[PDB]
Amino acid sequence: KNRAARVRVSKGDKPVTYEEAHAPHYIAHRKGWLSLHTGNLDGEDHAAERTVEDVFLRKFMWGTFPGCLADQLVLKRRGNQLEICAVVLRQLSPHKYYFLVGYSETLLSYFYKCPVRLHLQTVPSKVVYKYL
């Protein structure tokens, strides 16, 4: 059994979302891509550095928000304008959210030589699609 990143169908009790709920072969059909940059085309290079930066940013966003995030994060590498557009939960005070957003933007702009602006989305919790 080719057990991939798809959700196993067993008992109806796992609040699975919509992102990783689909099969890994429906990416170019019923899904999409979290990251997007010019390194994924013919004739371009420096893709290893882009992948390292992407995985480091993902780890940093997952560590700085222990549960404040819902699913994942969409990457938009517009040459020299990174945008970590994601969502936010309605559980903490807005002051803490503003503080964390400002700290992350300052760290990004002063470390990766790139300004970052966020676009938070008001959701109650995890975007659940099936209770299976």
Binding site: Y26, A28, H29, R30, G32
Partner: protein, 315 residues
């Protein structure tokens, strides 16, 4: 339930208003096709699935046809045949049985006083909010057939035609190539052709001898094997016209047999200009006016040649 539907409808209409305002046209003339075009232009979804497309239609298409309530505050259902699972299906069965017995009575009285297709189970269950099986559907189709075979008239005729449809086109005849004149070009015609990765453009004439030119030079220097010569002679032989038709094709890409078949197909499709339609039908039914999509099969990462496996033994 109705409150959420009204919320969706008001959201849809305010979104349509905003879209007609941002596009620059009048909201009354802002049809649904323009809505879809604007959504596709503003939200370019580059996927392969046709269901994952950004749509903004009426909530009647997004939400399925909800089953209405048949009982009121008193508890008595609104339909007569409700305490049996299926209501509309059994009502239609009773109606068609009544029509059948009416037709039988009318036929008995007459004896004493002396393009389209049927419905589909999927279409039926999508039109009527009701689920059925296959045996009952076959029985209903047989009852409809018995209704049609009987002596119909006007009322029963329109009643059985309301449960009909309309088939699409069935004449798959190709377009007849007209006669083109390009600078003193009498009996001039061109065609194309694509088979086994080979593109040919034959130029059939009706005023020369009996030779074939491939890329300027004759076909003898380009087709040394008699196989291609016979393949190109077959179309001219099927019409009994050899020494009165000259061609000059410019084929490119593919091997000898692929280019020969491409030129043959081009000649067959170009000869449909100075002959009747019965001859081109005879040529099509014999194997000329048809495509040959025999392309090389995609090799699999584990098989020898897209069919045979590797070296799988038993011990």
């Amino acid at each position: 339930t109705e409150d959420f539907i009204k919320k969706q409808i008001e959201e849809f209409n305010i979104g349509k208003r905003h879209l007609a305002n941002m596009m620059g046209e009048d909201p009354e003339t802002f049809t649904q096709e323009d809505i879809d075009r604007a959504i596709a232009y503003l939200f370019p979804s580059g996927l392969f699935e046709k269901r994952a497309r950004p749509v903004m239609k009426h909530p009647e298409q997004i939400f399925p046809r909800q089953r209405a309530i048949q009982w009121g505050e008193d508890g008595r259902p609104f339909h007569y045949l409700f305490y049996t699972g299926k209501q509309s299906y059994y009502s239609l069965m009773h109606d068609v049985y009544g029509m059948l017995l009416n037709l039988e009575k009318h036929q008995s009285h007459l004896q004493a006083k002396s393009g389209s297709r049927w419905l589909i189970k999927e279409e039926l269950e999508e039109m009527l909010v009701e689920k059925l099986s296959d045996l009952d559907y076959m029985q209903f189709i047989r009852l409809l057939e018995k209704l049609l075979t009987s002596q119909c008239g006007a009322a029963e005729e329109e009643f059985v035609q309301r449960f009909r449809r309309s088939v699409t086109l069935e004449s798959k005849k190709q377009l007849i190539e007209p006669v083109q004149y390009d600078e003193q070009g009498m009996a001039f015609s061109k065609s194309e052709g694509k088979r086994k990765t080979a593109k040919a453009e034959a130029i059939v004439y009706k005023h020369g001898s009996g030779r074939i030119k491939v890329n300027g030079i004759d076909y003898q220097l380009y087709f040394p094997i008699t196989q291609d010569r016979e393949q190109l002679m077959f179309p001219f032989h099927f019409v009994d016209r050899l020494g009165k038709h000259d061609v000059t094709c410019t084929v490119s890409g593919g091997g000898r047999s692929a280019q020969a078949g491409a030129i043959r197909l081009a000649m067959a499709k170009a000869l449909c200009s100075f002959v009747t339609e019965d001859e081109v039908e005879w040529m099509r039914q014999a194997g000329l006016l048809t495509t040959d999509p025999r392309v090389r099969e995609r090799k699999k990462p584990g098989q020898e040649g897209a069919r045979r496996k590797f070296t799988w033994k038993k011990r």
